[PDB]
Amino acid sequence: KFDETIDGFKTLKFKLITILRFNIRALCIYDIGSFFQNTKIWNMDVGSIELDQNIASLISELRRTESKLKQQLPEKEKNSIFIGLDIVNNYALIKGAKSIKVLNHNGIKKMLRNVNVLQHAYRNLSSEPSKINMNVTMNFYSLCGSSEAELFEYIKDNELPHCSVEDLKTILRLQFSEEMHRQLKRKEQSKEGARTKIGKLKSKLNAVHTANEK
Amino acid sequence: AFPNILQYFDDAFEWNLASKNLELFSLLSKMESSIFGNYLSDLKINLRDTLEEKFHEINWPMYTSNSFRVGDYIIEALMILIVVHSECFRIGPQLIHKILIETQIFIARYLFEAFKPYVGNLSNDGSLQIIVDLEFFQKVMGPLLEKDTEATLRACLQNCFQNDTNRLQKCINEINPIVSANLKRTAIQFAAFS
Amino acid sequence: TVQPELLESLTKEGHLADIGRDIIQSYISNREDFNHDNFINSVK
Amino acid sequence: VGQEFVAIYENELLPQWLETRSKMKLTNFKFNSPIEISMRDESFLAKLNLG
Amino acid sequence: LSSNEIVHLKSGTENMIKLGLPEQALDLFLQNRSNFIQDLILQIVDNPTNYLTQLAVIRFQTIKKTVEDFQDIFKELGAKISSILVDWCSDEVDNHFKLIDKQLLNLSPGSIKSSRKQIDGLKAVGLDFVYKLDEFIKKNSDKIR
Amino acid sequence: DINLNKATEFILVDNNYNSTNEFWDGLMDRLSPYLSYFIDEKLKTEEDMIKLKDFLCIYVAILENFKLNIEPLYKILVSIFEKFCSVSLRAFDDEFQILLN
Amino acid sequence: GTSDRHLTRKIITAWLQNGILMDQEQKILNGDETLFHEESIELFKEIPHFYQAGKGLSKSDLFNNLTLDTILQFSASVLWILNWLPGLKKAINIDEV
């Protein structure tokens, strides 16, 4: 009876595992609304209002998915699968989501506002707990929208559990640079502030937390 | 257990009682004393938080421009009154639904009536008009209850400064129309207390 | 008869599941040549 | 005949109501709110009328 | 517990009264309107003031209709059954403010105008709940501006 | 009068069979109504095409009060609005180039 | 239904250890707030490194997610096993009774 109820437990972890993978892969599916988001703009597209409709779809079927999932099953498993898989895939969703394109200072506020909306969404699933991917990815993609190399040294000396700091630091580098690399046109650009980000690639980037190589 | 004692006097010609056996029943009396006095504690304790409404900014510098009623003093009070009398009137029908209803009119009326004292000067702090508002919410408690409760009610009608003239009496007898306006909106909520 | 223009849905017909479950496009893997340059792009 | 009774009921009666209403709130229309408010008499459609 | 319509709901409601199980009957009925309003919320935040206005219109309007359904169905069924209705009413009003606060998590007061107007819509059949919203304003006075 | 089911004499699925029915009749007759609204977009001219949508969106809407009515309902009437876009579009100031004249 | 034949069931592709194994360690309490972005980003982005997001994808959003029918199925049977394991895992009544 221990092999029996053991096997039933194995079906429980398999099944709830499959549900958590389903919601999480629905999210990572849904982040491909950015792929393509039809040329997330260069330095601006002002205006620049709103709101990347696929993300509203993600909020929608996320919301109804939690509605019916709260209908049928019991509470604690739903809070478990939804909590862990939702917040974590939100964070790494922003992380790989950084690898996009040339960047927009108004579109910083656009994708910022969208990211704040999805923070309000997974928050609307659960927010009393540590809904910190709001704070982490908001200050991290905002930190990408930040173009100060002094802030690039200052932040990540104080915050940002940003383990993709090779691509993250190379991406905010590619964001101050993505403002630089089409600041002019032909060139677009001279890479002189990216000579200061070649030096700051060695200095504001390759002083990388005593593993000074990025 | 009374009929179990009488039918327990069957073969049993003991006497039948000796109601010193019914010390147990007196124990039941004490158990009854512990029982309702438990719950009539906590509701009263919850009605103690009644004083969070009417002290805070009610009968304050109060214009009170003819909202009929606005008596959140009496509104949320009579709400949780009708919540308790709601959720227990079926099985415990004509239990302390009725008895705790009467005692709720009591503790209601007394912990009400000692708020008019500190604003006994009857315009505090803006209540020249809200004289008639405290007259109105004072008149709200005439739903279905008893008369000695209404005696202490009309005792609290004369509680403040004016509240001593008969001009207050016949004036509120003219102010009865807005009370009738509260007696249709809101009607169906506290209609259960009838 | 899965050629480079008639390999996907004619093999996905009703009784064309008498061809294989991953050998629908490779229904001529029963032949000399299997299915003409990448027979096996369906099961994944 | 049954379909003509159905779209008779909705197209003749219902959109007359939800365009007749709202009239309180602009747009926002033809949707969940008018689903909620209409809901009137002659909602009694689907009991027997084609079944 | 299954029909989105009125006629079976009306009918088997008064048939359940015709058995004489009225309290269970009303409770199931209120549960059907609970699940009803519940699932009516499932059609869509898109942006906030719209969403709140929507939400209030569903919940309060259906409660008011449910009151006419009540006095309709429970003809001379007294005070007690009405008190059970007051239970369900107050429940749902609290659930409304819970859904309001459920996204304060980031408002402009025209939302509140929608709400208080419709709550006075419940005062058309005579039930105040504005005071709960007054305490809601009181303890939630951050983004009301 | 399919989903009047005292359910179920199939029982497949436990009230999910008619979803497959109007699903599939959505699917097969979709591409036929496609060209029937595309060819036959010219034969869906800027006249009672408005009454075509008016006699479709009502029937897109009072559906079950919905059950899976998506790809026909959204995509089809979407393309109908694209047709009214193009028809009113060439019917716009190109057809008011008399004012250019 | 695996028997791949003919489907890149990326959910089932995401049924691969140690991501499935640490996912069972992330199913243990579940994870008890050690919800490792190491684990979550590693396994859940590992097969999904295939594009990755990205950019410019070759990836999901109707590329082989489970349908709503199969969702209501899986939700149904998981509700069933939850109702099973109390009622049928109770009676072990030590040790052959």
Side-chain angles (χ1 to χ4, degrees), chain A residues 8 26 33 47 56 74 84 92 96-97 107 121 129 145 149 161 193-194 199 207 211, chain B residues 1 3 12 18 37 61 71 77 92-93 108 114 117 120 126 142-143 151 155 177 181 187 191-192, chain C residues 4 14 17 20, chain D residues 2 7 15 34 46 51, chain E, chain F residues 7 26 33 61 72 91, chain G residues 1 14 19 31 48 53-54 56 76 86-87 91:
Chain E
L1 261 294
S2 64
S3 71
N4 295 319
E5 48 89 41
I6 180 62
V7 178
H8 304 282
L9 189 59
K10 168 70 174 176
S11 76
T13 297
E14 286 174 351
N15 297 325
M16 204 73 206
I17 301 171
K18 194 179 289 183
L19 285 173
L21 279 78
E23 306 175 357
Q24 181 181 2
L26 178 68
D27 184 74
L28 292 175
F29 175 70
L30 297 172
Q31 186 178 0
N32 194 1
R33 310 305 297 159
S34 296
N35 300 315
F36 186 76
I37 293 170
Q38 185 68 43
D39 303 335
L40 260 293
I41 294 161
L42 270 72
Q43 303 307 110
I44 304 168
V45 173
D46 294 325
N47 265 309
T49 304
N50 300 317
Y51 175 72
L52 193 69
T53 302
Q54 183 72 254
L55 192 57
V57 167
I58 291 119
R59 194 184 299 270
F60 300 123
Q61 187 63 258
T62 312
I63 295 160
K64 184 180 178 184
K65 187 183 266 79
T66 311
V67 172
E68 293 180 356
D69 293 325
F70 180 77
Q71 292 174 355
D72 179 74
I73 285 168
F74 290 90
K75 50 187 71 60
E76 290 184 354
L77 267 302
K80 197 188 298 289
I81 301 100
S82 177
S83 69
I84 311 297
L85 181 62
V86 173
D87 300 330
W88 189 70
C89 289
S90 179
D91 288 329
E92 298 296 330
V93 175
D94 294 331
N95 297 125
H96 187 202
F97 295 111
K98 287 173 72 177
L99 267 81
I100 299 170
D101 280 331
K102 192 68 176 67
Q103 193 63 42
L104 258 67
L105 308 180
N106 44 3
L107 190 271
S108 299
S111 300
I112 305 166
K113 292 170 65 178
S114 169
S115 301
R116 66 176 65 251
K117 183 177 179 180
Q118 195 59 43
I119 295 161
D120 289 328
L122 294 184
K123 283 182 67 64
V125 293
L127 284 83
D128 190 359
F129 289 94
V130 180
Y131 64 98
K132 291 184 175 68
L133 191 142
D134 293 328
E135 292 184 354
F136 189 87
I137 291 172
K138 188 183 291 184
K139 70 181 71 66
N140 292 319
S141 296
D142 289 330
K143 284 183 75 173
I144 290 177
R145 84 280 173 270

